[PDB]
CSV table of C-alpha atoms and ligand atoms in Angstrom, one decimal:
chain,number,residue,atom,x,y,z
F,1,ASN,CA,-30.8,-19.3,0.2
F,2,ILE,CA,-29.8,-15.9,1.4
F,3,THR,CA,-27.3,-15.9,4.0
F,4,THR,CA,-28.8,-13.9,6.9
F,5,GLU,CA,-28.2,-12.2,10.5
F,6,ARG,CA,-30.4,-10.6,12.4
F,7,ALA,CA,-30.0,-7.2,13.6
F,8,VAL,CA,-32.4,-4.7,15.2
F,9,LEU,CA,-31.9,-1.0,14.9
F,10,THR,CA,-33.1,1.7,17.4
F,11,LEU,CA,-34.5,4.6,16.2
F,12,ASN,CA,-36.8,7.3,18.2
F,13,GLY,CA,-37.3,5.2,21.0
F,14,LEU,CA,-38.9,2.0,19.2
F,15,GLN,CA,-36.5,-0.9,17.7
F,16,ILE,CA,-37.1,-3.1,13.9
F,17,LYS,CA,-35.7,-6.4,13.8
F,18,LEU,CA,-34.4,-6.7,10.3
F,19,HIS,CA,-32.3,-9.8,8.7
F,20,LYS,CA,-28.9,-8.1,7.7
F,21,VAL,CA,-27.7,-9.8,4.8
F,22,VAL,CA,-24.4,-11.5,5.0
F,23,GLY,CA,-21.2,-12.7,3.4
F,24,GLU,CA,-21.2,-13.4,-0.4
F,25,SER,CA,-25.0,-12.7,-0.5
F,26,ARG,CA,-24.3,-9.2,0.8
F,27,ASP,CA,-21.8,-8.5,-2.1
F,28,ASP,CA,-23.6,-9.9,-4.6
F,29,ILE,CA,-27.0,-7.3,-3.7
F,30,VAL,CA,-24.1,-4.7,-3.7
F,31,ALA,CA,-22.5,-5.5,-7.1
F,32,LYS,CA,-26.3,-5.8,-8.3
F,33,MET,CA,-26.7,-2.2,-7.3
F,34,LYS,CA,-23.5,-1.1,-8.6
F,35,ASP,CA,-24.2,-2.7,-11.6
F,36,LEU,CA,-28.1,-1.3,-12.1
F,37,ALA,CA,-26.9,2.2,-11.0
F,38,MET,CA,-24.1,1.8,-13.3
F,39,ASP,CA,-21.7,2.9,-10.9
F,40,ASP,CA,-18.1,2.5,-11.9
F,41,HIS,CA,-16.5,4.7,-9.3
F,42,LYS,CA,-14.0,2.4,-7.6
F,43,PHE,CA,-15.1,2.5,-3.6
F,44,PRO,CA,-18.4,1.3,-2.5
F,45,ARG,CA,-20.9,3.6,-2.3
F,46,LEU,CA,-24.8,4.1,-2.4
F,47,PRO,CA,-26.1,6.0,-5.9
F,48,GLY,CA,-27.3,9.0,-4.2
F,49,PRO,CA,-26.3,12.1,-3.2
F,50,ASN,CA,-24.5,13.5,0.2
F,51,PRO,CA,-25.7,17.1,1.0
F,52,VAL,CA,-23.2,20.0,1.9
F,53,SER,CA,-24.1,22.5,4.3
F,54,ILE,CA,-25.5,25.9,2.9
F,55,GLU,CA,-23.3,28.8,3.2
F,56,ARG,CA,-23.7,32.7,2.7
F,57,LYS,CA,-21.6,32.3,-0.9
F,58,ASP,CA,-24.4,29.9,-1.9
F,59,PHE,CA,-27.6,32.5,-1.2
F,60,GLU,CA,-26.6,33.6,-5.1
F,61,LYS,CA,-27.0,30.4,-6.8
F,62,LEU,CA,-30.3,29.4,-5.2
F,63,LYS,CA,-31.6,32.8,-6.7
F,64,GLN,CA,-30.6,31.8,-10.1
F,65,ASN,CA,-31.5,28.6,-10.2
F,66,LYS,CA,-34.7,26.0,-9.7
F,67,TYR,CA,-34.5,24.2,-6.1
F,68,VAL,CA,-37.1,22.3,-4.0
F,69,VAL,CA,-36.8,22.4,-0.5
F,70,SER,CA,-37.9,19.5,2.2
F,71,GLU,CA,-37.5,19.0,5.7
F,72,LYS,CA,-34.7,16.7,6.4
F,73,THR,CA,-35.9,13.8,7.8
F,74,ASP,CA,-33.4,12.3,11.0
F,75,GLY,CA,-33.5,8.5,10.6
F,76,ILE,CA,-31.0,6.8,8.6
F,77,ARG,CA,-30.4,7.0,5.4
F,78,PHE,CA,-31.0,3.9,3.1
F,79,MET,CA,-31.1,3.1,-0.8
F,80,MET,CA,-34.0,0.9,-1.1
F,81,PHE,CA,-33.4,-1.8,-4.0
F,82,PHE,CA,-35.6,-4.1,-5.4
F,83,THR,CA,-34.1,-6.9,-7.3
F,84,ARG,CA,-34.0,-10.9,-7.7
F,85,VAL,CA,-31.4,-12.9,-5.8
F,86,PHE,CA,-31.4,-16.4,-6.6
F,87,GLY,CA,-34.5,-16.5,-8.4
F,88,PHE,CA,-36.2,-14.4,-5.5
F,89,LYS,CA,-37.6,-11.3,-5.2
F,90,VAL,CA,-35.7,-9.2,-2.3
F,91,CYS,CA,-36.5,-6.0,-1.5
F,92,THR,CA,-32.9,-4.4,0.3
F,93,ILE,CA,-32.5,-1.6,2.1
F,94,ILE,CA,-28.7,-0.3,2.1
F,95,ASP,CA,-27.0,2.0,4.2
F,96,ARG,CA,-24.0,4.4,3.9
F,97,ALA,CA,-21.3,1.9,4.8
F,98,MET,CA,-23.0,-0.5,2.4
F,99,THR,CA,-24.8,-2.9,5.0
F,100,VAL,CA,-28.1,-4.7,3.3
F,101,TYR,CA,-30.9,-5.9,5.4
F,102,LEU,CA,-33.8,-6.9,3.6
F,103,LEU,CA,-37.0,-5.0,4.4
F,104,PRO,CA,-40.2,-6.8,2.9
F,105,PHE,CA,-43.4,-5.4,2.1
F,106,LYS,CA,-46.1,-7.7,0.4
F,107,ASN,CA,-47.7,-6.1,-1.9
F,108,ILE,CA,-44.2,-5.0,-4.0
F,109,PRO,CA,-45.3,-4.9,-8.0
F,110,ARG,CA,-43.5,-7.8,-9.5
F,111,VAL,CA,-42.0,-4.7,-12.0
F,112,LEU,CA,-40.1,-3.1,-9.0
F,113,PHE,CA,-37.9,-6.2,-9.1
F,114,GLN,CA,-36.6,-5.6,-12.6
F,115,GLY,CA,-34.5,-3.8,-11.0
F,116,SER,CA,-36.0,-0.6,-8.8
F,117,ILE,CA,-33.5,1.7,-6.9
F,118,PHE,CA,-35.1,4.7,-4.7
F,119,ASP,CA,-33.1,6.6,-2.2
F,120,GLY,CA,-34.8,7.6,1.0
F,121,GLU,CA,-34.8,7.6,5.0
F,122,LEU,CA,-36.0,4.6,7.4
F,123,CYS,CA,-37.4,6.7,10.2
F,124,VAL,CA,-40.7,6.7,12.8
F,125,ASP,CA,-43.8,8.4,12.6
F,126,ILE,CA,-44.2,10.3,15.8
F,127,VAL,CA,-48.0,10.1,15.5
F,128,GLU,CA,-48.4,6.7,14.9
F,129,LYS,CA,-45.3,4.8,16.6
F,130,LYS,CA,-44.9,2.9,13.7
F,131,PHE,CA,-41.5,3.2,11.2
F,132,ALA,CA,-42.0,4.6,7.9
F,133,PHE,CA,-40.0,4.9,4.9
F,134,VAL,CA,-39.8,8.1,3.2
F,135,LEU,CA,-39.0,8.2,-0.3
F,136,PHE,CA,-36.5,11.5,-1.8
F,137,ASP,CA,-36.0,10.3,-5.2
F,138,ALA,CA,-35.5,7.1,-7.8
F,139,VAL,CA,-32.3,6.2,-10.0
F,140,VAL,CA,-33.6,3.4,-11.5
F,141,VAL,CA,-37.1,2.3,-11.8
F,142,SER,CA,-38.5,-1.2,-13.1
F,143,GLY,CA,-35.2,-1.5,-14.8
F,144,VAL,CA,-35.3,1.6,-16.9
F,145,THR,CA,-32.8,4.6,-16.0
F,146,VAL,CA,-34.3,7.6,-14.8
F,147,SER,CA,-31.2,9.2,-13.1
F,148,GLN,CA,-30.3,11.7,-15.5
F,149,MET,CA,-34.0,12.9,-16.1
F,150,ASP,CA,-35.0,15.7,-13.8
F,151,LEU,CA,-36.7,15.6,-10.4
F,152,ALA,CA,-40.3,15.5,-11.7
F,153,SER,CA,-39.6,13.1,-14.0
F,154,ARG,CA,-37.9,10.2,-11.6
F,155,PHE,CA,-40.6,11.0,-9.1
F,156,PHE,CA,-43.3,10.4,-12.4
F,157,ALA,CA,-41.6,6.9,-13.1
F,158,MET,CA,-41.5,6.4,-8.8
F,159,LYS,CA,-44.9,6.9,-8.3
F,160,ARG,CA,-46.0,5.2,-11.7
F,161,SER,CA,-44.4,1.8,-10.4
F,162,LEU,CA,-45.4,2.1,-6.9
F,163,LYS,CA,-49.4,3.5,-8.3
F,164,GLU,CA,-50.9,0.1,-7.1
F,165,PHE,CA,-49.1,-0.7,-4.2
F,166,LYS,CA,-51.1,-0.8,-0.8
F,167,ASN,CA,-49.0,-1.4,2.8
F,168,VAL,CA,-50.8,-4.1,4.9
F,169,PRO,CA,-50.4,-3.5,8.5
F,170,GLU,CA,-48.2,-6.5,9.4
F,171,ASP,CA,-45.6,-4.4,6.9
F,172,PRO,CA,-42.5,-3.3,8.6
F,173,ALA,CA,-42.1,0.3,7.3
F,174,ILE,CA,-44.7,2.6,6.0
F,175,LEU,CA,-43.7,3.6,2.4
F,176,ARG,CA,-44.1,7.4,2.1
F,177,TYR,CA,-42.7,9.9,-0.3
F,178,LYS,CA,-40.8,13.2,0.4
F,179,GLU,CA,-43.5,16.2,-0.5
F,180,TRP,CA,-40.7,18.8,-2.1
F,181,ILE,CA,-41.8,22.4,-2.3
F,182,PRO,CA,-40.1,25.2,-4.8
F,183,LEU,CA,-37.9,27.2,-2.8
F,184,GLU,CA,-39.9,30.2,-4.3
F,185,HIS,CA,-43.1,29.0,-1.9
F,186,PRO,CA,-41.9,29.9,1.6
F,187,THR,CA,-45.2,29.9,2.9
F,188,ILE,CA,-46.2,26.4,1.1
F,189,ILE,CA,-42.6,25.3,2.6
F,190,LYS,CA,-42.9,26.7,6.0
F,191,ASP,CA,-46.7,25.1,6.1
F,192,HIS,CA,-45.5,21.8,4.7
F,193,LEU,CA,-42.3,22.2,7.5
F,194,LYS,CA,-44.6,22.5,10.2
F,195,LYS,CA,-46.8,20.0,9.4
F,196,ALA,CA,-43.7,17.7,8.3
F,197,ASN,CA,-42.4,18.3,12.2
F,198,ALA,CA,-46.0,16.8,13.3
F,199,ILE,CA,-45.2,13.4,11.9
F,200,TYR,CA,-41.2,13.0,12.0
F,201,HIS,CA,-37.8,13.9,13.5
F,202,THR,CA,-36.4,16.7,11.2
F,203,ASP,CA,-32.9,18.2,11.7
F,204,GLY,CA,-33.4,21.4,9.5
F,205,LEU,CA,-33.9,21.2,5.5
F,206,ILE,CA,-32.9,20.1,2.3
F,207,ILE,CA,-32.6,22.3,-0.8
F,208,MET,CA,-32.2,20.5,-3.9
F,209,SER,CA,-32.0,21.1,-7.6
F,210,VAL,CA,-35.5,20.8,-9.3
F,211,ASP,CA,-33.2,19.7,-13.0
F,212,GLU,CA,-30.2,18.3,-12.4
F,213,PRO,CA,-29.5,14.1,-12.5
F,214,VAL,CA,-28.9,12.1,-9.5
F,215,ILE,CA,-25.5,12.8,-8.0
F,216,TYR,CA,-23.7,9.8,-6.3
F,217,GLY,CA,-21.6,11.0,-3.3
F,218,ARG,CA,-21.0,14.2,-2.2
F,219,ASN,CA,-23.2,16.9,-4.0
F,220,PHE,CA,-21.9,20.1,-3.8
F,221,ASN,CA,-25.4,21.5,-5.0
F,222,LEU,CA,-27.3,19.6,-2.7
F,223,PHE,CA,-27.8,22.2,0.8
F,224,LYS,CA,-28.7,20.8,4.2
F,225,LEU,CA,-29.6,23.6,6.7
F,226,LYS,CA,-29.8,22.7,10.6
F,227,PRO,CA,-31.7,25.0,12.3
F,228,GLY,CA,-30.3,27.7,14.1
F,229,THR,CA,-26.8,27.0,15.8
F,230,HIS,CA,-27.1,24.2,17.3
F,231,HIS,CA,-24.4,22.1,15.5
F,232,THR,CA,-22.3,19.5,17.9
F,233,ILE,CA,-18.8,17.4,17.3
F,234,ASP,CA,-17.6,14.2,18.7
F,235,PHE,CA,-14.2,14.7,20.4
F,236,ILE,CA,-11.8,12.2,21.6
F,237,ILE,CA,-10.6,13.2,25.1
F,238,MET,CA,-6.7,12.9,24.7
F,239,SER,CA,-5.9,13.5,28.9
F,240,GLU,CA,-8.1,12.8,31.6
F,241,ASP,CA,-8.1,17.0,32.0
F,242,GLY,CA,-10.2,17.3,29.0
F,243,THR,CA,-7.7,18.3,26.2
F,244,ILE,CA,-10.4,16.8,23.2
F,245,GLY,CA,-8.7,15.9,20.0
F,246,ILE,CA,-9.9,15.4,16.6
F,247,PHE,CA,-8.9,12.9,14.3
F,248,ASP,CA,-7.1,13.6,11.2
F,249,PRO,CA,-8.1,10.3,8.8
F,250,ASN,CA,-4.6,10.2,6.7
F,251,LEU,CA,-2.2,10.5,10.1
F,252,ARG,CA,-4.7,8.3,11.9
F,253,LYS,CA,-3.4,10.6,15.0
F,254,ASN,CA,-5.7,12.7,17.2
F,255,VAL,CA,-4.7,16.3,16.9
F,256,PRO,CA,-5.6,18.2,20.0
F,257,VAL,CA,-7.6,21.1,19.3
F,258,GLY,CA,-9.1,22.9,22.8
F,259,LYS,CA,-9.8,21.7,26.2
F,260,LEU,CA,-12.8,21.1,28.3
F,261,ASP,CA,-13.4,22.1,32.3
F,262,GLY,CA,-13.9,19.0,34.2
F,263,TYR,CA,-12.7,15.6,34.8
F,264,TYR,CA,-12.5,13.3,31.5
F,265,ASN,CA,-11.7,10.0,31.3
F,266,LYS,CA,-8.7,9.5,28.7
F,267,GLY,CA,-10.3,8.0,25.6
F,268,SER,CA,-13.7,8.9,25.7
F,269,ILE,CA,-15.6,10.5,22.7
F,270,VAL,CA,-17.6,13.5,24.2
F,271,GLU,CA,-20.2,15.2,22.0
F,272,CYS,CA,-19.8,19.0,22.6
F,273,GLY,CA,-21.6,21.7,21.3
F,274,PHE,CA,-19.9,25.2,20.9
F,275,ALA,CA,-21.0,28.0,23.2
F,276,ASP,CA,-19.3,31.6,23.6
F,277,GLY,CA,-16.3,30.9,22.1
F,278,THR,CA,-15.3,27.1,24.0
F,279,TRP,CA,-16.4,24.0,23.0
F,280,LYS,CA,-19.3,22.7,26.0
F,281,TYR,CA,-20.0,18.9,27.0
F,282,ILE,CA,-23.1,17.8,25.9
F,283,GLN,CA,-23.1,13.9,26.2
F,284,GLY,CA,-20.5,11.4,26.3
F,285,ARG,CA,-20.8,8.7,23.9
F,286,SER,CA,-20.2,5.2,25.2
F,287,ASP,CA,-21.3,3.9,21.1
F,288,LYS,CA,-18.3,5.7,19.7
F,289,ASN,CA,-14.4,4.9,19.7
F,290,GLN,CA,-13.6,7.5,17.3
F,291,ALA,CA,-13.9,11.6,17.4
F,292,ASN,CA,-15.0,13.5,14.1
F,293,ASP,CA,-12.4,14.2,11.2
F,294,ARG,CA,-10.9,17.5,11.0
F,295,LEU,CA,-12.8,18.3,7.9
F,296,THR,CA,-16.3,18.1,9.8
F,297,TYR,CA,-14.5,20.2,12.8
F,298,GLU,CA,-13.5,22.6,10.0
F,299,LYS,CA,-16.5,22.6,7.9
F,300,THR,CA,-18.8,22.7,11.1
F,301,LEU,CA,-16.9,25.7,12.5
F,302,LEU,CA,-17.2,27.6,9.7
F,303,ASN,CA,-20.9,26.8,10.2
F,304,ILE,CA,-21.6,28.1,13.6
F,305,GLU,CA,-19.7,31.2,12.5
F,306,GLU,CA,-22.0,31.8,9.7
F,307,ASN,CA,-25.4,31.4,11.4
F,308,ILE,CA,-27.5,30.7,8.4
F,309,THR,CA,-30.9,30.2,10.1
F,310,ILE,CA,-34.0,28.4,8.7
F,311,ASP,CA,-35.8,32.1,9.2
F,312,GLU,CA,-32.8,34.0,7.3
F,313,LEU,CA,-33.1,31.3,4.4
F,314,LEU,CA,-36.8,31.2,4.3
F,315,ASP,CA,-37.1,35.2,4.3
F,316,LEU,CA,-34.7,35.5,1.2
F,317,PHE,CA,-38.1,34.4,-1.0
G,1,GTP,N1,-30.1,13.4,0.4
G,1,GTP,C1,-30.5,13.5,1.5
G,1,GTP,N2,-30.6,13.4,2.3
G,1,GTP,C2,-32.0,13.5,3.5
G,1,GTP,C3,-32.8,13.9,3.1
G,1,GTP,N3,-33.8,14.2,4.0
G,1,GTP,C4,-33.5,13.9,4.9
G,1,GTP,N4,-31.7,13.5,4.7
G,1,GTP,C5,-30.7,13.1,5.7
G,1,GTP,O1,-29.8,14.0,5.8
G,1,GTP,C6,-28.9,13.5,5.7
G,1,GTP,C7,-27.1,14.7,5.4
G,1,GTP,O2,-26.0,14.5,5.8
G,1,GTP,P1,-25.4,14.9,7.2
G,1,GTP,O3,-26.1,16.4,7.4
G,1,GTP,O4,-24.2,14.6,7.4
G,1,GTP,O5,-26.5,14.1,8.3
G,1,GTP,P2,-26.2,12.6,9.3
G,1,GTP,O6,-25.9,11.4,8.0
G,1,GTP,O7,-27.0,12.4,9.9
G,1,GTP,O8,-24.8,12.7,9.7
G,1,GTP,P3,-24.7,13.9,11.0
G,1,GTP,O9,-24.8,15.0,10.5
G,1,GTP,O10,-23.3,13.8,11.4
G,1,GTP,O11,-25.9,13.8,12.3
G,1,GTP,C8,-28.6,12.2,4.4
G,1,GTP,O12,-27.6,11.6,4.8
G,1,GTP,C9,-29.8,11.9,4.9
G,1,GTP,O13,-29.7,10.8,5.8
G,1,GTP,C10,-33.2,14.6,1.8
G,1,GTP,O14,-34.4,14.7,1.1
G,1,GTP,N5,-32.2,14.2,1.0
C-alpha cells in the first residue's frame, strides 16, 4: 500500500486534511519525480524556480527581454506530480522541503499518470472559502518533457492534458491556472492584479521570462516584488534585553545584529519590520525556533533600501 500519515494544513483561516506520504513510499515518489524531471542535482529539490527580488539593476534586463507578470499567490508552494506507484495512479503535491502529500481528484485523465509535473501554489479562494491549486507552469506532461519549450508551449501542453478534466465538489483543491500577462501591457496587468486580489491573498507580483526553459532552483531571472516597503525578518532574541541575532547557517551560530526596545524572552523568534533606521517588533513567532539566515537578512536590507514599488515598476511600461 502507500504508507500514509494524516496531516492538516492551515491557510488563511481554513484547513485541509491531507495524507502525508511517509517512509519508503515518500522516497519512491521523490525519486520518481527526480527521474521524470531529469534532475541530477545531488540535493533533493522541486523541479521549479525560486524567485529573486527585483533590484534597480534588473530594470535594464526587463526592458530588453520578453516577460510575463502575475500576482504572487500567498499559500504553499507545491510541485504537483501525477504518477503511478505500485500500479496505482497517485496525484501527489510536494513541497520545497520535499514533503509528499496525496491530493486526489476524481476525474484526472489517465494520460496525466504517464508522468505529469506541474508547478503551483496551494492557496485559498477568499470569495468561495475553499482551497485552490493555481498552476504556474508545467515541466513534464503525460511523459513528454516540456521544460525546454517556452512558456506558452508548456501551458499549451498543460492545458491540453487537462482539457477534459472537471472538478467535482468533493475534490480537495479547485485546480486553476495562473493567468500570465505580458509586462508591456501595464493596464492589463493592473486590472488582472486588481481582479486577482479579489480571489486570492497575494504578496506582490511575479515577473517571469516568456521564453527561457524551466529552471530548477534559484532563478536569477524570475523576479518577485513585494508591494512597497513591507518586508520583515525573524530574528532570534539573544538577550532578555532584545539583542536580536540572525543565523549564520555555516557557523550554526547566531550573530548579534541589532537590539530591540522592550523586554524579550531569550531564544524566542521575533518577526520585525524595518522602520526609521531600526527593526521594530511585529509579532513573536512561537512556531519557529530559528532566525532567518544572513543572506535573507543581507538581501532584505538591500530591498528595503532600494524601495522598489509596484507602481514604479508598473510605470516603466
Ligand atoms: N515561482 C513562482 N512562485 C510563485 C508564483 N506565485 C506565487 N509564488 C510563490 O512565491 C514564492 C517566492 O519565494 P519567496 O519570495 O521567498 O516567498 P516564500 O516562500 O513565501 O517565503 P517568505 O518570503 O520568507 O515568506 C514561491 O516559492 C511561490 O511559493 C509564481 O507564479 N511563480
